[PDB]
Amino acid sequence: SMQEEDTFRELRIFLRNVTHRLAIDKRFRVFTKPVDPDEVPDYRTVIKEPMDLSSVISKIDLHKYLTVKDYLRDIDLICSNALEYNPDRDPGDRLIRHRACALRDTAYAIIKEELDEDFEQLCEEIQESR
Numbered sequence: 001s002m003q004e005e006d007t008f009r010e011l012r013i014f015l016r017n018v019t020h021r022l023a024i025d026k027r028f029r030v031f032t033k034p035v036d037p038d039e040v041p042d043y044r045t046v047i048k049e050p051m052d053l054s055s056v057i058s059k060i061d062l063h064k065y066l067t068v069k070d071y072l073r074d075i076d077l078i079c080s081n082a083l084e085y086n087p088d089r090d091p092g093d094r095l096i097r098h099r100a101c102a103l104r105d106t107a108y109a110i111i112k113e114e115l116d117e118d119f120e121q122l123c124e125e126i127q128e129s130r
């Protein structure tokens with residue numbers, strides 16, 4: 001219905017605003033673009049599903065997310081990819097792990113404080129009806 005298309009349009013506006021706010025924080029600059037396969041040819045042999053904040057904005061615009069749950073699965077993949085690729089005790093590794101955990105906690109805290117529980121339940125019921 002037209003009312004259902006208006007629901008999904010409101011969801012995309014909300015997700016773009018969350019994602020752009022994460023993308024301007026100086027801590028998260030390393031997550032804003034894909035890993036350059038030149039500089040890091042090894043990356044794509046270890047990490048099977050690369051993900052970054054530029055890719056997330058492209059996916060919103062292609063209508064790939066019908067719920068906040070499916071968006072948070074991509075935020076979780078940005079974080080898990082950084083933890084898996086950089087697991088060592090050295091400071092470079094420890095700094096990117098700390099930043100990855102901060103990105104995930106920041107996204108969850110914005111959504112907890114700014115999404116109504118009933119808007120997300122409506123998106124999940126339209127999704128399950130398709």
Ligand SMILES: CCN1C[C@@H]2C[C@H]3c4onc(C)c4[C@@H](O)[C@]2(C1)N3C
Binds near residue numbers: 035043082085086096
């Ligand atoms: C050129 C200096 N490198 C330091 C970082 C460690 C590792 C990494 O893991 N996730 C991302 C994103 C990145 C890149 O920022 C990075 C580039 N590497 C491929």
Ligand SMILES: CCN1C[C@@H]2C[C@H]3c4onc(C)c4[C@@H](O)[C@]2(C1)N3C
Binds near residue numbers: 113114115116117
């Ligand atoms: C319980 C009634 N809700 C009204 C508000 C609308 C929306 C929202 O957007 N930013 C913030 C902050 C808030 C919350 O205060 C709120 C709680 N919602 C999640």
